Design a protein around this ligand. Sequence first.
Ligand SMILES: Nc1nc2c(ncn2[C@@H]2O[C@H](COP(=O)(O)OP(=O)(O)OP(=O)(O)O)[C@@H](O)[C@H]2O)c(=O)[nH]1
Ligand SMILES: CN[C@@H]1CCc2c(ccc(O)c2O)[C@H]1O
Lengths: 280, 51, 332, 231
Amino acid sequence: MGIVMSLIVLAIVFGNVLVITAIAKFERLQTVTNYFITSLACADLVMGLAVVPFGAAHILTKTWTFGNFWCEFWTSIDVLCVTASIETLCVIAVDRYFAITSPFKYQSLLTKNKARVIILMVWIVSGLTSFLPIQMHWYRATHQEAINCYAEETCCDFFTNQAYAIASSIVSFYVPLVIMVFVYSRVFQEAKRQLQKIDKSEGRFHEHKALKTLGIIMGTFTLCWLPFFIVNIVHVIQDNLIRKEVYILLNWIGYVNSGFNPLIYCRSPDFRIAFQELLC
Amino acid sequence: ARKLVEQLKMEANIDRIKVSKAAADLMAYCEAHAKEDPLLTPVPASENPFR
Amino acid sequence: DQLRQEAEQLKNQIRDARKACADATLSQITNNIDPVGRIQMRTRRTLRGHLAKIYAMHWGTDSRLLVSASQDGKLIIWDSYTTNKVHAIPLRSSWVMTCAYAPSGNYVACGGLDNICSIYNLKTVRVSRELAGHTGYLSCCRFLDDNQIVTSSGDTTCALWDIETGQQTTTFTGHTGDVMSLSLAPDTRLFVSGACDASAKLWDVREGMCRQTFTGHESDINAICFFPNGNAFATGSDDATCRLFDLRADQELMTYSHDNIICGITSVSFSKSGRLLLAGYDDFNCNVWDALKADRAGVLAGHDNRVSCLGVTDDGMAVATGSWDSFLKIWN
Amino acid sequence: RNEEKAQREANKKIEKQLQKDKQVYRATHRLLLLGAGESGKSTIVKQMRILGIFETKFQVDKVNFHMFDVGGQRDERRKWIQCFNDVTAIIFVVASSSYNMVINRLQEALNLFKSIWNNRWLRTISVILFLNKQDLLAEKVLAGKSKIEDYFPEFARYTTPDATPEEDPRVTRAKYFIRDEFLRISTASGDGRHYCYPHFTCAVDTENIRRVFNDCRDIIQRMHLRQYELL
Ligand SMILES: Nc1nc2c(ncn2[C@@H]2O[C@H](COP(=O)(O)OP(=O)(O)OP(=O)(O)O)[C@@H](O)[C@H]2O)c(=O)[nH]1
Ligand SMILES: CN[C@@H]1CCc2c(ccc(O)c2O)[C@H]1O
């Protein structure tokens, strides 16, 4: 599995690095929309460069060879990156909703200054739920196995109580899901209305595209991050119901989503020209 | 009407020299003034004002 | 009538005389000259602040300041050395297609779709005079002197103006298509003009009569530059070609074209020594030619839209380009 | 010394003014009014407004529109049209009752529209079409000496197309044939970037400004939808 994990790490790093350098190098890609894209790319790069290799080493050697402080820092970084990699998608969806639904007032509403505030607020909210309740010992569990793991300085699993498990899941995944669903439903309705108007107007002379695009965009995210955020509550509500191996497998399936964002949000022809200009 | 004919007649009678002489003069001027072209000959960066 | 048949004769006589005078081509004479070699230039400055695409610019006589015009209705006078603005003049009309900088550095003129040539007083910034009389959009204007200016408009005429009284002095007629550009001789005694009928003419500023006519091209002419020697000029048309005409020989000399380009040409300029010919194209880049060899020597890429302006400093230290991407670049 | 500081202060003031003006420039919408002679272009402008250049600015629902009328230059060749490649839409006004009059006016209008549509610099610009004089046409059709078939042979094998009168079948047939004449040219030339729009107007009409508002909104919405690969 080491070859597979190394390939996963390389795929995660390469695409995000290429996207960031293509956005930064050129001037025609400096759009208010691209700030969210580069924020997401930075989050994915930090994830794939910080949390994936240490997790791979831990799952291979089956023994944490560092101290407790580094383990807590690793867990905090994991939670921070996971939380910050989804609110950016929610912000992108909201921006597209504003752009399509109200075409006349879009230009005034998002101005570059307004965007650097939204990104900072998103990052602050992401960091306020990862570092604060983990550097402090609020999330620590109570069963004897938890204390045995906490005392030991050579191994550390993830044990959490009910309150933190529910709250972090709600903040990270469940809240930014209904907003995206509503936004994309409204966008699909608008696209269908425009298509019907065109067909009624000039159909005697001359919906798969919207369905395909929305299906890809929603399905990849839902399939990647849905089961883990259900078993997260399941294993806490019911004891001895979810095995550790299944939990780790689902969590690692969640990690792979960070390597697909360039393949979905960077299919524009301008990005293709930018990628052809350098390293080709 | 006759304005075009008059203009053509006016421009018909002019002195015309051989093209070889004109080409030689152009080449001679280009060769003579070839030492004062910063774009053609890159000047040292010490005296470059834009760099 | 009979005269029209009669007229063609004179054309046959002129063609026969020009063919007889052609002893040898320029390429044959200029064959042992060592090539200049590959020439590479890099961007040194970038100027930002225009909200829309740029049509025109003109260097200062001191090779330090320059003026620019855009479609947002605003003239900006930059300081190329310290890359900071100096002036920002609003305009009554937002459609302008030309601008000029006076040799004395005291006035700046502009015009556009509105048939008015406005003149601004920099060292007093308020409108000084407004010249009217053209029935078509202006295309170019060059300060012949601090008191008189010459303009070319879209009604197939070029006129000489008097700034003090605001009245036309001399009117030049004879063209058929819309006049698009002009350039003055170093002594300001003659000027040329290129219209949309594929013909460039030589004008006399004092007498006010056309002296010669050149019809080598086959499409509309978009730009004209004048050789530093004062006895030649180069033109650029929509057929992706450039041609080097001559005055004393009264015929063209050489053509600059390649089979890999099918776009148009928007601006043409020379160098201080005249060895290099610079032309802007519609391929979002610029090209450098060799005047005496018709061999490409380099390409200036870096613009995200078509290049519409081009100019070289009086002392020939740098070349400036403008594009529809609302950006001005300085190449050394 | 202090000259650099003075230039920096001047540059800061100029940059502040430019930043202030950028929002105003971005807020407004620009339109171009293009049409042939005797169409009725001068009337439309006034009715709507009352509610060698001529710029009319009207505001609807706190949105700024700025329309131009370039009537100073009158020539078949149009070398100045490259300047209007960044406008929101082009308004085309044509007299629909001009078919019977030589210097044919309707054929010249069709040729002008075909030339405009296929222009290289106007490959992503939509056209709003105003078919003017909708009552002179009805008067001519109803018991008229001239017939459309004599000047337009294709009218002999034409059918009424979803048509909603208001009317006699003859006037509806004539109107829809004239509209389809323009609609055919538009469908063939381009794929997606631009779409022509037709309308029926007359002298007693006050909803033209609302029509322009709705058409501009549709144009911007369709552009945004196509940009994100949804249409
Ligand atoms: N019945 C009727 N008459 C109209 C209508 N529109 C214009 N007209 C008449 O036709 C003439 C149109 O001319 P103007 O609108 O003044 O100017 P114009 O001829 O459109 O200008 P160009 O078309 O650019 O030459 C006017 O004198 C109007 O009386 C209409 O909708 N109904
Ligand atoms: C061990 N990995 C952690 C464990 C729990 C957790 C994650 C991510 C977001 C959350 O809100 C969580 O509660 C996972 O990345």
